RNA sequence: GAUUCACGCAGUGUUAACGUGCAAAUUACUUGUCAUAUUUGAGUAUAGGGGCGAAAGACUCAUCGAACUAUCUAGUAGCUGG
RNA sequence: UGAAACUGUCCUUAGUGCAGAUCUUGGUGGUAGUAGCAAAUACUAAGAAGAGGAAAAAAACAUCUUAGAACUGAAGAGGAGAAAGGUUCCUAAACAACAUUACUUGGAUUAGGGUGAAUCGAUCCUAAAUUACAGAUGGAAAUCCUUAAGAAAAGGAUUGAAAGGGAAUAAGAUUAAUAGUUCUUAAUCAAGAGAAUGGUAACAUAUCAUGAACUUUAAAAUGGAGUGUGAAAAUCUACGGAAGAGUUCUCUUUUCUUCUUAACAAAAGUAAAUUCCACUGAAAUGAAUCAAUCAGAGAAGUGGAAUUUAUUGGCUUUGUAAGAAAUUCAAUGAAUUGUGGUAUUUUUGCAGUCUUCAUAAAAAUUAAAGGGAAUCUUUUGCUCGUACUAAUAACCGCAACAGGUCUCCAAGAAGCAAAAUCUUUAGUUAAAUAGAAUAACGCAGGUAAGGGAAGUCGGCAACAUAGCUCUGUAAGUUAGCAAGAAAGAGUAGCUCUGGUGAUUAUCGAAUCAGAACUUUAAAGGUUAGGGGAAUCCGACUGUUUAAUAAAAACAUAGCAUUCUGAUAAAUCUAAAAGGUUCAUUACAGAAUGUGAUUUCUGCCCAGUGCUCUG
RNA sequence: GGGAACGGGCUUGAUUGGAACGGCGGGGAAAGAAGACCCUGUUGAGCUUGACUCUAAUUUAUCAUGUGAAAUUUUCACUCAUUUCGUUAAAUGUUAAAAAAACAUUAAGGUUGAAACAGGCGAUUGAAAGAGAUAGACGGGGAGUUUGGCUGG
RNA sequence: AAUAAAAUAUUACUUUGGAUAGUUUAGUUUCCUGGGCGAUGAAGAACGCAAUGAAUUGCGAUAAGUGAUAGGAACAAUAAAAUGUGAAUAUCCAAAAUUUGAAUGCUUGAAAGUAUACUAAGGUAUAUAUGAUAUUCAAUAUCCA
């Protein structure tokens, strides 16, 4: 019963959306985000996660105020 | 659920709003390749993970 | 039945409806739709006829 | 190998004390002037059952000697105390059952319980059900007295340590034979998670040092030095004797 | 036999989710939310339930008449009439004894 | 922590069905059990030479005599294939 | 064929020549019109719409209405919620794809519509637990501490429950869909604005009838079992009718349906149980329960007080309120809406009894007391959730998967029974396609002459006993059991008789026993123990390898051994005014072996351990 | 028959009409899976142990300067770092002067009423213990690794 | 012995598939110049804004855009309006800049919220550490009348 039957009771969320990164990686019982490293001030980045760095970093968003400054 | 937070309901409403197709007039523009929205999903076809 | 900004409460909606249309409001019921708009149900005083206000607004 | 269950007990994750319905901390009132140069009178309002311990606890109510109000204590019941009784604590208290006196004002051969090992520490020794300590001798030279601990050991204490006269209630608790595994299950309702104890020999070599082979046996002596590292310290530690006694 | 449904969104038979099925017009049965059972006051000494005070919820004594939550007697509403008689005798008899014991015995 | 039946549960036997299945462990009858060492929801605690185990090396997201994931890493191969 | 670039020679350069690597990526065959589209009892007739039942029976035809026949059988295939899903809800147009045939159907395509709260919840409080400033620790990241270390917080900070606690809303109607939320009517709550009498006493008086600091008490707020009983609802039933429907060639003064009432308040009439008060003082001891249990620190008796009994005050009754609603009749308008029960079940309280080496939460918040400091009308009630499924099609399993997933309401028959079986209200007739033929071999359910385990590793599988009543019951035994031992007899239908009560002859309860007569000689439609004599293991109830082992394995109580005076023992951590047993204290904590009870545990200290006061 | 010693193909013969339907289980050394038994590899992993080499924890000695004595270097006496505790840091020190389950508070200019002062909040331990460094012992609790070859397997 | 249904063989044409050929608003590498963010709130995330938009793009309650400076007649899928009295377009400029985020009055889960002061609503300020100055204090800590 480790296969099909045991999947029926899965109706309790472990992660929900995080306030800082918008992903569903906020652990409800650990009170921290698995992806962006919430309340920790620094963003969670690792050298072994090089793809994770090229997915969310500088230049992946709007750059509302930095696009004018560097252009200036 | 029946009970939901305020912000969570608005992110549910936006998912409803984005499940629409290309309007006909947009398809008649010159040099147009966008015919169907490939970001479409249905409640019984794919769960949106939120 | 109006559509208002979600950041407005029944107290400000009641004042705004009176100010904009010069009527009397005795009850406001609001619900926030899925899209994001706050639908308001405004009931006017018995001596104010709502049907004539609709024609002035443009619904008729 | 793995970590034995003895090692896992020191972490305190599922082995924490089940102290939710406990009444409080059973101890004497804090030492002050009126307990050192006079007497305070306490009223035994009620006798109650504290989960996880065999002796009943008494709710004693002293008046506040310095301010206006009450001062609610929680003593361990001496065998004989009743509701509505008056008990007196202090250096001048009479030698009646239930009264708290400094250990130096008690005659030789007297019986005390809830003794203080160090003055003002509100009770350490002789606290279990039916247990008591007996005063052996005094020494006015250095103001120290000797008492006999319930294990037969003799201990020397400062003569101003407080103690309650009498015997802790609930004697004979362990003389009734448990009969069912269910009854032993209910004993640890307000205690730690230790009851169903699997024999080490029934385990596997990874889990325990006793985890045996094709026959359930230990294979090496079960008497170990005190300096054994945790994990291999299983059996009898620093044992000077074994076998049955004649 | 008419079968009913929970009106509120509670779905479990907890103490606060007690219901009573009453009958209404046309043979329809509706659902009433019934209150919990409270306890009355107790004497501070003997722990016996006092007489003359109703067994209602603590906030409901605010709606009670000012004379319907206490008994017109010294230590009324906190002590039984027997709890008070012994108080008077203790106060008087002990003071009398302390007048012959000390004060020119 | 008596004997049983029932709502449920389990999984003794048929070593029945099925075995490119209803199903990556299910079905039918039979059997056992069916409230105090009971059954169960939500919350909460315990994390990889760690935890948890009425102890089977069992369980730890279909993964366990050491999980999953990424990096060192195009690890090394006197061996096999081209 | 194709329609804009390309070729020869010499040198130079190389990501330069493929049949293989279970090679990589893509495309495609035989298999093959083959295996299949067979769990969930079941559909038929007439009509409508539609291109879509034609025809030499092409034997089948999706959707909707009516009729017939059926199934889930009220612990449901019913009516509603929590998690999860997220627009799947409703309507209209439309069917290319999808739901193993088809579809006019759809949880599918397109486009609009839909979720209304002072009273329901979140918001508020704290529980297990969780996280901050300063401090402590660490090379570091960071860890510790949660009131202890602080010039911090009258006293201890943050979070933590849509099942724990909590101020206050009900009935009817209404929408294609929301409704304790809208409408009508009727209420409630919070925040406001405009130094008293009576009673012997228990105690009592539409606000009344002052009551600060400070302190205390109580409530919120507390297990389970089993027995008795009050009350309501449901079912059943008695009397009395009103209205409508069914049967009626054979009868039936007959069978069936309706005869209702909210929140909040009032107080004609009137209950059960418990606890107190006054008079008096019990023995010739009384009183009382199903059981108990109680009495000179005072019984029974009489007279009182109080509280509980789903809102005021439990039931009837009353305002609400008949104007509503239900059942009929007429073409909007008219008719009625008594009284009971020594029956059963459920719910809800109450009363004492039993049980624990188990004693079965806290805060927000409220009231009262001790004390004596001081001298009716009207306004407002903010933010957020609210649609729908909640499952043999909306959830998790790749899916419209026979698997899994927490709850509430709950009719008749029959029976000990919430059992099997059949029906009522509600729901549905479709839920991976049919038609013809009726071969072998299969899957599921059966029967059998004579014999009766001769089959086989093995009575595997099947057969067989089976309810109730009476009689009767062995060895063995821890004296409790074995025991439903084993064994034997009875049981139907019809017509009668007697026993078991209440009020002063009438009224009611299903239960037991007995007697004639008849027959197909009677538990058996369904449900429903095979029995006996021994041996081995485990004492027992219990747990176990999710997915080949449920056991003789683990656990268990019992027995025993070892260490420890708490600044300790065990033991987590890199460290730490750090952490666990420990809210603890030898009848305790920690570490082990054996495995109930009875009986007995023999000899050996040389070796290896451990220890020593040497 | 021979062949890698059990051919559908080769050699010699027996014999053959093309397409197939329902069954069936002899063969296709049928399918599923880089044999899981055995061996080899200077390939591993779990577990054990006085296998080799180490290590956490435990333990022992020396160093790390509190005063004041006394002996022949432990042996003591104090507190002053230090250890362990307790409270609302709530009368410390020295002078002066068991009859009763009830109540107990906001006192009749500014000092008495309610005594003054100590340079110690109250105890406990104590120059020893603990942590550090170096050195010996113990240490499968744990880490790494190894466990020759030939051989009628 | 016999037939060519099936089977086989070649070519042409069609079909399934997308190789080959032609092609490039895309990449790779080297070199040159810089290496110009943030409490005056960054990077990132969310939500919202077009006459008809779902994504994407641009932008922020002044919204696929405003003012100013250059610029000179367009846009287009379909309508409208405005337009040489200045349409598209560009910019190191000006105004404006929702919720968050180091996120900083307090709380934050998917949480709706909320206290004080200043200037009913609206807007500012209030985290921790920290330098300088001013000011109010605490300690018989050192003296001292």
Automatic annotation (TrEMBL), chain A:
A biological process term (GO) from this entry: translation
One GO cellular component, as annotated: cytosolic large ribosomal subunit
Alphabetized GO MF terms: RNA binding; rRNA binding; structural constituent of ribosome; zinc ion binding
Pfam families noted in UniProt: Ribosomal_L37e
Alphabetized UniProt keyword annotations: Metal-binding, Ribonucleoprotein, Ribosomal protein, RNA-binding, rRNA-binding, Zinc, Zinc-finger
Keyword Hydrolase included in the entry's annotation: no
Keyword Ribosomal protein applies: yes
SUPFAM superfamilies assigned: Zn-binding ribosomal proteins
Family: Belongs to the eukaryotic ribosomal protein eL37 family.
Protein name as annotated: 60S ribosomal protein L37-A, putative
Species annotation: Entamoeba histolytica (strain ATCC 30459 / HM-1:IMSS / ABRM)
From TrEMBL, chain B:
This protein's UniProt keywords: Ribonucleoprotein, Ribosomal protein
GO BP annotation list: translation
Keyword Ribosomal protein attributed: yes
Molecular function GO terms recorded: structural constituent of ribosome
Short name of any one Pfam family annotated for the protein: Ribosomal_L39
GO CC terms: cytosolic large ribosomal subunit
Signal sequence residues: none
InterPro entries xrefs: Ribosomal_eL39, Ribosomal_eL39_dom_sf
Family (UniProt): Belongs to the eukaryotic ribosomal protein eL39 family.
Name by which UniProt lists this protein: Ribosomal protein L39, putative
Species the sequence originates in: Entamoeba histolytica (strain ATCC 30459 / HM-1:IMSS / ABRM)
UniProtKB/TrEMBL annotation, chain C:
UniProt KW ATP-binding keyword: no
GO BP, one annotated term: translation
Lineage: Eukaryota, Amoebozoa, Evosea, Archamoebae, Mastigamoebida
Source organism: Entamoeba histolytica (strain ATCC 30459 / HM-1:IMSS / ABRM)
Family: Belongs to the universal ribosomal protein uL23 family.
GO molecular function: rRNA binding; structural constituent of ribosome
Keywords associated with the record: Ribonucleoprotein, Ribosomal protein, RNA-binding, rRNA-binding
Domain of life: Eukaryota
Shown chain mapped onto the complete sequence: 62 to 121 of 121
Protein name stated in the entry: Ribosomal protein L23A, putative
Any one GO CC term of the record: cytosolic large ribosomal subunit
From TrEMBL, chain E:
Molecular function GO terms recorded: structural constituent of ribosome
GO biological process, one term: ribosome biogenesis
Coiled-coil stretches: none
A GO CC term attached to the entry: cytosolic large ribosomal subunit
Keywords, sorted A to Z: Ribonucleoprotein, Ribosomal protein
Entry's family note: Belongs to the eukaryotic ribosomal protein eL34 family.
Protein name: 60S ribosomal protein L34, putative
Taxonomic source organism: Entamoeba histolytica (strain ATCC 30459 / HM-1:IMSS / ABRM)
